[PDB]
């Protein structure tokens, strides 16, 4: 039943979308970040200032210690944990319980964030990027092996008490309108895809399309921003600046380190361009585009202290590890992770972004003469 799964996600702007899960016997309830950009199931398992609660292994009679540790450094933050297995369920997901690997986080630095309301991360990507290595079976692989659940899930993330839906085992048509367009998964590690063209307010960036995928492009619900390779980022910022030049932006705004604010309701959306990302289609040299509005890439901040005005952070940033289509891109689209057919689908979601003049869209097909492979691999 997909209806029971609708609206099973919550979150805070720029804080992460999480689903309720249980671990252990009897079940211990925790909120878990849904992350298509990693492959470990990892949960706080010791007290922490920012943790509202944690996994208590000694209180679970079904816990099995794997007698192995794991250290996972990120660019920002890090945690250390002990690997084990236990019974895991998703109360508002599939009606099943499975035994899964769990990394019990016993030490961390700048990993858990105050007020996020999640206590762990559910890595939904593939084993190749699991830590400490690809022999640690990811949760979704365990789910499919141990149950009759079809090998796919879909995410409908809705921007700013319900934050969206994770539907496991199929597609819920009530969550999107129009056509569902599919792009192939290039390699099963991250959810890697190929961008073939980029336009900003209708204007082609006219780069070799391999530049858009240097050194990979991925779909990642565990990253807030649209992250772009240096060359593409500079070109995008140049275009957006030119379009919005009628207004001055604080030092550091384009680096994402500063807010811009307007009086309530007066945000000049119309001076900001739409961004179109064309994704490789399922047929040779065909593609489709998803169009991103400023309502997506100018992310609202919901801090009470700033609430007299409407303030935003620039949610596009520079990457040295490839393009990342993060949450601000996924928001408003229904995104189908069709692992069974090695493809990802996009459709306009019931909570898609729009104003009176413009709307997020998924459109195709588009045809390209140049037969170059846009893969950087």
Ligand X SMILES: C[C@@]1(c2cccc(NC(=O)c3ccc(Br)cn3)c2)CCSC(N)=N1
Residues lying near ligand X in the complex (CB under 6 A): 14-16, 33, 35, 37-38, 74, 111, 121, 220, 222-224, 327
> Least separation, in Å, of the C-beta of 281 and ligand X?
26
Choice between 112 and 272, CB closer to ligand X: 112
> Least separation, in Å, of the C-beta of 284 and ligand X?
31
Bridge partner list, 70: 81
- List of residues 6+ apart from 58 with CB closer than 8 A: none
Please state, in angstroms and rounded to a whole number, the distance separating the CA atoms of residues 375 and 194. Answer: 6
Q: What 3-state DSSP class applies to 228?
A: strand
**Cα–chain-centroid distance for residue 111?**
17
> Least separation, in Å, of the C-beta of 190 and ligand X?
9
**How many residues in the chain?**
377
Choice between 84 and 163, CB closer to ligand X: 163
Place of tokens 């470990």: 40
Termini Cα distance of the chain: 39
Please state, in angstroms and rounded to a whole number, the distance separating the CA atoms of residues 222 and 260. Answer: 24
> Least separation, in Å, of the C-beta of 332 and ligand X?
13
Could you say which of 220, 303, 309, 310 is catalytic?
220
Choice between 15 and 85, CB closer to ligand X: 15
Specify whether 220 is catalytic.
yes
Please state, in angstroms and rounded to a whole number, the distance separating the CA atoms of residues 143 and 147. Answer: 6
Q: Are 313 and 301 in contact (CB under 8 A)?
A: yes
Please state, in angstroms and rounded to a whole number, the distance separating the CA atoms of residues 245 and 238. Answer: 10
**Cα–chain-centroid distance for residue 105?**
22
> 99-118 burial by CB neighbour count: b if 16+ within 10 A, else e?
ebbbbbbbebeebbeeebeb
> Least separation, in Å, of the C-beta of 265 and ligand X?
24
- List of residues 6+ apart from 262 with CB closer than 8 A: 268, 309, 310, 311
Choice between 119 and 199, CB closer to ligand X: 119
Please state, in angstroms and rounded to a whole number, the distance separating the CA atoms of residues 37 and 64. Answer: 27
Choice between 57 and 131, CB closer to ligand X: 131
Choice between 196 and 218, CB closer to ligand X: 218
Place of tokens 């009759």: 148
Which residues form the catalytic set? Answer: 220
């Amino acid at each position: 039943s997909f209806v029971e799964m609708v609206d099973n996600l919550r979150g805070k702007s720029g804080q992460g979308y999480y689903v309720e899960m249980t671990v252990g016997s009897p079940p211990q309830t925790l909120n878990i970040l849904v992350d298509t950009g990693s492959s470990n199931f990892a949960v706080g398992a010791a007290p922490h200032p920012f943790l509202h609660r944690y996994y208590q292994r000694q209180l679970s009679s079904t816990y099995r210690d794997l007698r192995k540790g794991v250290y996972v450094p990120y660019t920002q933050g890090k945690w250390e944990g002990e690997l084990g297995t236990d019974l895991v369920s998703i109360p508002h997901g599939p009606n099943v319980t499975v035994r899964a690997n769990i990394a019990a986080i016993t030490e961390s630095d700048k990993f858990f964030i105050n007020g996020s309301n999640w206590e762990g991360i559910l890595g939904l990507a593939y084993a190749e990027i699991a830590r400490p290595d690809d022999s640690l079976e990811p949760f979704f692989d365990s789910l499919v092996k141990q149950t009759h659940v079809p090998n796919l899930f879909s995410l409908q993330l809705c921007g700013a008490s319900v934050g969206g839906s994770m539907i496991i085992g199929g597609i819920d048509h009530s969550l999107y309108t129009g056509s569902l367009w599919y792009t192939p998964i290039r390699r099963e590690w991250y959810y890697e895809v190929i961008i073939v063209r980029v336009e900003i307010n209708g204007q082609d960036l006219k780069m070799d399309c391999k530049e858009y995928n240097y050194d990979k492009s991925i779909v990642d619900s565990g990253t807030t921003n649209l992250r772009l390779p240096k060359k593409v980022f500079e070109a995008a910022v140049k275009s957006i600046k030119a379009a919005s030049s009628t207004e001055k932006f604080p030092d550091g705004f384009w680096l994402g380190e500063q807010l811009v604010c307007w009086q309530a309701g007066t945000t000049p959306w119309n001076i900001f361009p739409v961004i179109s990302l064309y994704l490789m289609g399922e047929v040779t040299n065909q593609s489709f585009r998803i169009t991103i509005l400023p309502q997506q890439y100018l992310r609202p901040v919901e801090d009470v202290a700033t609430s007299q005005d409407d303030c935003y952070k620039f949610a596009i940033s520079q990457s040295s590890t490839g393009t990342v289509m993060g949450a601000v891109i996924m928001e408003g689209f229904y995104v189908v992770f069709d692992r069974a057919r090695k493809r990802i689908g996009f459709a306009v979601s019931a909570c898609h972004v729009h104003d009176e003049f413009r709307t997020a869209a998924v459109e195709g097909p588009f045809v390209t003469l140049d037969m170059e492979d846009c893969g950087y691999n």
